[PDB]
Symmetry: D2
């Protein structure tokens, strides 16, 4: 009505799925990575899930370069690390800001969202087709139909871990999903989310044809917590123990994924290397509860603001550079061989 | 989609708008109320916005009797109060329970949402058509298209004040919106939410036709905080909130939720909160621009065999006699603050 | 799309069905009438189906006045006639012209089709709720979803009996369907259509949600020919016998509905009474194959034109000329008398 | 809905458009061919439109082989003939085609048939061979009409208001067949109705019903296909020309060599060719086009052999080369 200025046409998921179908290789990649993460979340596999990549995708060419480098390390460190690339097309803002490649691919408030979906699905498809699994945050309620079939692992953001519609979304997603602890370090909201997402739900959603409908979900038991800090970090064994106690109390597996960035690094990118030190000591000491980690990495460390932009630098959160990334990864895989 | 078991047809919004179109009376009710709340939020009216009514509606018949009683008080106290009926269809919770009138109108877990939507719109239509404005809660992104044209005020869920998708929704709502503070009593997320909601946004949404589309909003400047709690209705807390709002550059105004934490989960304590808030107002507090009270015909609650008439099946409410006294307490207070 | 000037929002059928649901009595009218026509078609009832009423609906008020009068005769004559009102909202044109109430309800080329659908369904609902069944021509491929649940009988026009998409539509309609012979008098196109409509089909159509979809139909066994004349009228006994033998050779029951109007009256509205006199003699003489008739009838006889700009007369056709109410009463009593004589 | 058994999902047009967008080559083929046919119909080109190809496409491989052979004769005889391939994906009966049942088994895999048909049309146009189609359905056109340079309304639907409405909004020129009996009145009526603007309900590229308004289509003409007796002779053209002139329309005609004009015999198409060539070479400027049922192999088959029709019987490639050259020489003599 009065506060809706304009309404514009939107391609339906089925149109993106027809233009950019999954290649056989892409399908195989997704299936294998999901099965491997299920094996890790059920304890049958001792390796570590590493979700690593840019805070946000804004340049498909650099992403293709990053993916080529990360894919090499995935094949080399595969005995200790299940590497999944961060391919974030959606970004939650504390108040306002650039919301990601889908919402605004030209970074200029043009909102060419149909091109955003075309660009994002094609990049996601090419990455998977090369053999590299991909991960994203599921923030929007309507975009998942265009992308989810190419997602090997998903995240629910700290500012939406408490959101019913997002817990419902998780309960129907074909991939494992991680829920961030609240902005204040509150762990309870995430356990409740894991519990909710493991149950069936009945709710309103949008179909592959772009039409609203009633949807019934089965429940997703491949769900786990992601520690991302609060006013202070929470990546330490002590914190891990507290969390593992809350998980056992709730009838849930005492498994944790540790995010080296955001509140766990105080928004200082280089601090991810020190969080890595601490977590690697926990693994080498015997912590089987750390089943995964998450790292904000890019070709060039730091971040830049939004006219032409520097190559390989994040336009959102500051990331560690590739050299630090190659090193961080070997450290993690060294700690995994020690724990084994 | 291997964790999606079934997909069933949903009536498009235009089907419910064609079946239950707004009468001229209902449309006038909504327009007048929205204007009145804007005037209060702009500091151009010294009257108190009162959103009052059941925790959740589970019986349209009892809701219409409530609306008749409340309408009478709305006319008697209009010089001091802008009375809006709380027409909430669900109690958001994580534990198991009735999913509300839209999700489960027959209260049996049959999830007859088409039926629920029909019942909800018809009730909203009837209440507005009688002259009583209605206030709702926005818990998802798809049902507002069926109902918001009959809402004069809305509240975003407490568990979603932080969510970008709910802030995007508020940016394009035609009615004023209240954002609840944090479970710790902090006001930062609600300030972030008011800022975000006041900005223009572009996002994906379902249209009146039942199809996803791209929508651009203007931003909603009629948003405010709701203080809902340990309790935070006290004058110290109100001063603290006013300070945070002034520093953030927002108007130092607040709506106070008398129920839940602010009442330590004891329905009768809403009368204690009322006594305190009335004290703050009569002494001169102009920041308190609204209140929220959980009220029904019959006080208390019951668990969902027949049910007691007019008694909440969700959270406990004050009953009509207390409601009549509370509203007179608030009105006498508005007279005092004035002169 | 260089020749598509404008595209506009259309209410989906679920909106009209939700706004105007069938009442209990309306649904009863439709179900009873369809069953009664099925019975006549199977040879288990000796009554005459009579489809009668305006060439086109353009005024809901006159249409309801007409319906009330017709309903009273429907009740009075129901041992002899199964009376169904023509409630035609769609008109096929020889070239160009007003396409009917749905396409253009204000009759001024404003094409307010959403209001037309609303006006049309509400009228169909009021007429059925009163107890009077309704008949229409199925011309448009999208409008049936808005109306077909309130239709007891349908016609596929002379210009579309040959059309594959209309034969497909008929194969999935829940009501009996009449196929008019071709505009040049050809019977075979009508027999082919009956056989086509009796078979299952798979085709593209629009659902009640206004979306395209793939539909599978079961086939419609309640189809028959309508005799509407060609270069010359084809209502006489010589013509009915050729149609009877033509139908049997194709393996179909020798049954016919005769349209008294259009080419069988040589487009001279009062000649419907001359056809009536001949068809009555045939029926009362023992002709069982004549299972129905069709008559263009209004409150006031004649027609009038919209081209004038003059205010329209009440109760008078803006399309084909029609007989007025007095002749209509006399004609229905003639038919009932003949059906009684056929029996005794 | 007692007589409706099942309702199955259908890809919206936007899905097939996104999967199979028009190459710039395809788009240019379409545009140039449409503008050239306009020029023939406005009488500013003495060239002859030739719509030629199989009665029906059942094998995309054989259809692409035909397209290749025909493109050669197209560029060779371009100064006399505007050659457009007949790519007929919907068939009228009383098997509805590759779109309705691509695998030919009553499996009715229409989403696959739509995918196959749009791909074949896109490939043929990308090559430089414009395509011609029959418009039988009101929904299929939104998935294929962008790749069509000319279209026909079948004889069984010339009289139908809903097909005239569709014709009035098509971006391509349209031919209307005379009805089964040699009479042109329904076809003259159809040309007049399709020339006028119309408002009607249709399905958009998004798969939703909506109200559309059309401008009218002035690029419509008659197609003589005969009836009980053939109507391609000079006497017949003259009668049709007088009828057209009385109705107020350009006195122009396309002549279908097959069907009744051939009395259901594929070799008689060569005889009609003889006759029409004699008429054109004698100075008949009113014959602006012809239609021939041609395949790589001659004849037909039922319920397969390669490059042979499973519908109407067609002429083989040798006869096809000969006929195209005959028409070209005839148009050369008309010009000279
Ligand atoms: O209603 C019927 O049963 C019909 C349709 C008939 O009413 C037609 O619509 C006009 O006679 C055409 O009028 P024009 O020839 O002026 O376009 N039978 O043919
Ligand atoms: Pr980040
Ligand atoms: Pr674009
Ligand atoms: Pr409550
Ligand atoms: Pr129901
Ligand atoms: Pr008529
Ligand atoms: Pr209107
Ligand atoms: Pr053929
Ligand atoms: Pr397939």
């Amino acid at each position: 009505d009065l506060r809706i200025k304009e309404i514009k046409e939107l391609l339906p998921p089925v149109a993106l799925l027809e233009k950019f179908p999954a290649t056989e290789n892409a399908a195989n990649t997704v299936a294998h990575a999901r099965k491997a993460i299920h094996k890790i979340l059920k304890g049958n596999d001792d390796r570590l899930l590493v979700v690593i990549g840019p805070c946000s995708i804004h340049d498909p060419v650099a992403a293709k370069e990053y993916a080529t480098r990360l894919l090499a390390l995935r094949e080399e460190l595969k005995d200790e690390l299940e590497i999944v690339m961060r391919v974030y097309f959606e970004k939650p803002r504390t108040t306002v800001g650039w919301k990601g490649l889908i919402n605004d691919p030209h970074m200029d408030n043009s909102f060419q969202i149909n091109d955003g979906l075309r660009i994002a699905r094609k990049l996601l498809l090419d990455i998977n087709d090369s053999g590299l699994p991909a991960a994203g945050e599921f923030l929007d309620m309507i975009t998942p139909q265009y992308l989810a079939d190419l997602m090997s692992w998903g995240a629910i953001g700290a500012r939406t871990t408490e959101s019913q519609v997002h817990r419902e979304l998780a309960s129907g997603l074909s991939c494992p999903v991680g829920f961030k602890n609240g902005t204040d370090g509150t762990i309870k909201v995430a356990i409740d989310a894991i519990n909710a997402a493991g149950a069936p739900h009945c709710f309103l959603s949008v179909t592959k044809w772009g039409h609203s409908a009633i949807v019934n979900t089965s429940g997703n038991g491949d769900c786990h917590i992601i520690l991302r800090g609060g006013k202070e970090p929470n990546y330490s064994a002590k914190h891990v123990a507290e969390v593992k106690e809350g998980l056992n109390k709730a009838g849930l597996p005492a498994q944790v994924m540790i995010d080296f960035s955001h509140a766990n690094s105080s928004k200082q990118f280089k601090k991810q290397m020190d969080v890595c030190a601490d977590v690697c000591q926990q693994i080498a000491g015997g912590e089987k509860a750390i089943i995964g980690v998450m790292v904000e990495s890019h070709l060039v460390e730091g971040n830049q603001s939004l006219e032409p932009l520097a190559y390989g630098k994040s336009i959102t959160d500051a990331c560690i550079g590739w050299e630090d990334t190659d090193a961080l990864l070997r450290q993690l895989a060294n700690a995994v061989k020690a724990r084994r």
